[PDB]
Write a protein that binds this ligand. Structure first.
Ligand SMILES: *[C@@H]1O[C@H](CO)[C@@H](O[C@@H]2O[C@H](CO)[C@@H](O[C@@H]3O[C@H](CO[C@H]4O[C@H](CO[C@H]5O[C@H](CO)[C@@H](O)[C@H](O)[C@@H]5O)[C@@H](O)[C@H](O[C@H]5O[C@H](CO)[C@@H](O)[C@H](O)[C@@H]5O)[C@@H]4O)[C@@H](O)[C@H](O[C@H]4O[C@H](CO)[C@@H](O)[C@H](O)[C@@H]4O)[C@@H]3O)[C@H](O)[C@H]2NC(C)=O)[C@H](O)[C@H]1NC(C)=O
Lengths: 421, 59, 78, 53
């Protein structure tokens, strides 16, 4: 079924270190008859950025979302099933939204203590797709007004910080072209190298989640001497440095302990808001570039809000990856859900595909046989990836008793030994 | 001494102190405190208390 | 589904863990002291085994639940 | 004797060595070491007086 894109108001913006581009595709069907239904729809990724895609989600104007199946038919084209089938002559506003990660490189690799980390992007003027488009005007939103070199095609006009590109009225089927912008982006370049999220469930009280976070400043690796005197007595000094970041908690965290590998960290400010618990965190030292830090954050939240129990079968729906900072990015994430002593049947409903390893056993303070753990390995997590993961497990109600009685028996055996003595 | 068995600590060359020279920890320290703490930690582990080695070593 | 199930209200309200632990521990400790006292002050001729066994059982029972609830109160939530 | 002993234990003979305090906390002795542990080549040769070895 032939499809024609009519309007594509794609607007790549690079204010942060994530190059999230949204294109307001408008699809129409050709006048050709007998091709009434076109339920499917196709999408494509540029060959340069194909191995960098973060969450890519489709939409329809209004309150709706669509499912984009991943298949190979080569740039791993995404098949989108339109909610309502469209006959010839119809129009369907498809607001395709994607997010590219690790696509911004600092062109001056070794800035000194006081310079602005100029970065460089390698985009694509035309909207890469499998259908020939009509006029399409890509508007680029930048971070600062210090462009150095931007590709000129159709005389791109310049606003205060927005570069507008002229409407390309006609393009071919697989139109490709590369443009690069050399602007100044002194924004927090923070990449979480790895994160391990451990979720321990306990039927007695609450559920305690702790996460180890390795995080590293990526762009503009520091060169030359570092001087605290200049850092203190000068505001201009250390523009690229990140003094602190704020982590939104889930509004029920009771006691949150921010602790590094070496010891409890004095500096952190948490404020209990109406809908959440904000927590500003300062690392031990102000990161500049290639300065990695490792910390531990862990809070236990009441079980009644989350755990759902029906007769003998329980369910636990929770956040796969919790918020860490504004416009985060993860490079390796391992979720471990430590269920209680008995989890006979452990089915898990993942919102998206998660690589999963076999289950193993964990040995807590009173477990005699162990407790099952669920491990899930994922890479390239971003802010949009935050979703709800639900696990269904059957736990015998009386099994929880099985722990205290054993503690009694051991005590009793010692008493019996004394009697023998 | 906790993670690695006693026999892998009685003789032990620590090449992370006195860089050019290197000091032997296996035969220069009285192994009393380390074998009373390792034993007190192993007994707890055998009883599935699973306490930390930085928490049975402070108390 | 998810609507059929309802919030998992804990069997024991957590706010009651401290007091519950205290009384249980107290009683258990008292029983243990009694057993030890009986063990010290008893000749071979007069050592009733039924009494010893019963006191031991009660002591161990209370001490076990006490330690468990104390651990729970400490926030380990085993 | 019990009173004086508690007071002596409390006020003076109990002070963390690596946590200079006056509540305001000075934890530099830890921040610098952590920096060293994370932002130096894996084969450095940090030289300091025998006190901090
Ligand atoms: C082991 O580690 C843990 C974790 O690190 C550690 O626990 C921490 O201990 C510290 C104590 O040093 C606790 O710090 C507290 O933080 C409270 C929260 O502060 C936030 O909210 C303040 C309120 O702002 C509101 O109102 C203003 C208008 O007034 C408004 O603008 C705001 O928007 C908001 O509505 C806010 O002022 C505060 O801002 C701080 O940071 C900014 C920088 O962003 C700075 O410019 C400010 O000047 C200010 O410093 C922050 O946003 C805070 O309320 C609380 O204050 C009490 O103590 C201080 C003295 O320290 C008094 O002056 C004050 O009147 C209060 O009595 C205190 O600062 C922190 O919460 C703990 N965190 C955790 C997780 O426990 C342990 O201590 C460590 N263990 C040991 C042994 O040390």
């Amino acid at each position: 079924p032939p499809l024609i894109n009519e309007d594509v108001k794609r607007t790549v913006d690079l204010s942060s270190h994530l190059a999230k581009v949204t294109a307001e595709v408008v699809l129409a069907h050709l006048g050709g008859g007998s091709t009434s239904r076109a339920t499917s729809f196709l999408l494509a990724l540029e060959p340069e950025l194909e191995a960098r895609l973060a969450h890519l989600g489709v939409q329809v104007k209004g309150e709706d979302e669509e499912e984009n199946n991943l298949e190979v038919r080569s740039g791993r084209f995404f098949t989108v099933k339109l909610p309502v089938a469209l006959d010839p002559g119809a129009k369907i506003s498809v607001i395709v939204e994607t997010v590219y990660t690790h696509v911004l490189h600092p062109y001056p690799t070794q800035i000194t203590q006081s310079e602005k980390q100029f970065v460089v992007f390698e985009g694509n003027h035309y909207f890469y797709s499998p259908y020939p488009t009509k006029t399409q005007t890509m508007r680029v939103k930048l971070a600062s007004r210090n462009v150095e070199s931007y590709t000129k095609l159709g005389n791109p006009t310049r606003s205060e910080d927005l570069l507008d590109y002229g409407p390309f009225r006609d393009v071919p089927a697989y139109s490709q072209d590369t443009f690069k912008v050399h602007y100044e982006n002194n924004s927090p370049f923070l990449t979480i190298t790895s994160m391990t999220r451990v979720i321990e469930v306990s039927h007695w009280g609450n559920i305690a989640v702790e996460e180890n976070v390795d995080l590293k400043h990526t762009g503009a690796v520091l060169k030359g001497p570092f001087s605290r005197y200049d850092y203190q007595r000068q505001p201009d000094s250390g523009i690229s440095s990140i003094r602190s970041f704020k982590t939104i908690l889930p509004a029920a965290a009771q006691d949150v302990y921010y602790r590094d590998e070496i010891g409890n960290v004095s500096t952190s400010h948490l404020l209990i808001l109406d809908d959440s618990v904000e927590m500003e965190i300062r690392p031990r030292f102000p990161l500049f570039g290639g300065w990695k830090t490792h910390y531990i954050v862990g809070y236990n939240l009441p079980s009644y809000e989350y755990l759902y129990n029906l007769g003998d079968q329980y369910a636990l729906k929770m956040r796969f990856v919790d918020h860490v900072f504004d416009e985060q990015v993860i490079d390796s994430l391992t979720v471990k859900i430590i269920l209680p002593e008995g989890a006979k049947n452990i089915e898990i409903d993942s919102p998206y595909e998660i690589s999963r390893a076999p289950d193993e056993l964990h040995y807590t303070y009173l477990d005699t046989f162990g407790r099952p753990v669920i491990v899930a390995y994922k890479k390239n997590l971003v802010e949009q990836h935050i979703q709800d993961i639900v696990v269904h497990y059957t736990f015998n109600k009386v099994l929880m008793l099985q722990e205290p009685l054993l503690v009694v028996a051991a005590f009793y055996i010692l008493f019996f030994t004394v009697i023998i003595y | 001494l906790a993670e690695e068995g006693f026999y892998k600590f009685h003789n032990w060359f620590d090449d992370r102190a006195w860089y050019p020279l290197g000091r032997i920890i296996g035969g220069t320290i009285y192994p009393g405190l380390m074998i009373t703490s390792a034993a007190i930690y192993h007994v707890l582990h055998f009883f599935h208390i699973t306490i930390d080695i930085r928490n049975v070593c402070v108390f | 589904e998810l609507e059929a199930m309802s919030r998992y209200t804990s069997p024991v309200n957590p706010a009651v863990f401290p007091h519950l632990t205290v009384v249980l521990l107290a009683i258990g400790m008292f029983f243990t002291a009694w057993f030890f006292v009986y063990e010290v002050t008893s000749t071979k001729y007069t050592r009733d085994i039924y009494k010893e066994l019963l006191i031991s059982l009660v002591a161990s029972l209370f001490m076990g639940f006490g330690v468990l609830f104390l651990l729970l109160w400490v926030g380990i939530y085993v | 004797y019990t009173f004086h002993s508690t007071w002596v234990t409390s006020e003076a003979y109990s002070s963390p060595s690596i946590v200079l305090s006056a509540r305001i906390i000075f934890d530099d002795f830890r921040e610098a070491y952590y920096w060293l542990r994370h932002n130096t080549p894996e084969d450095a040769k940090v030289m300091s007086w025998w006190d901090y070895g």
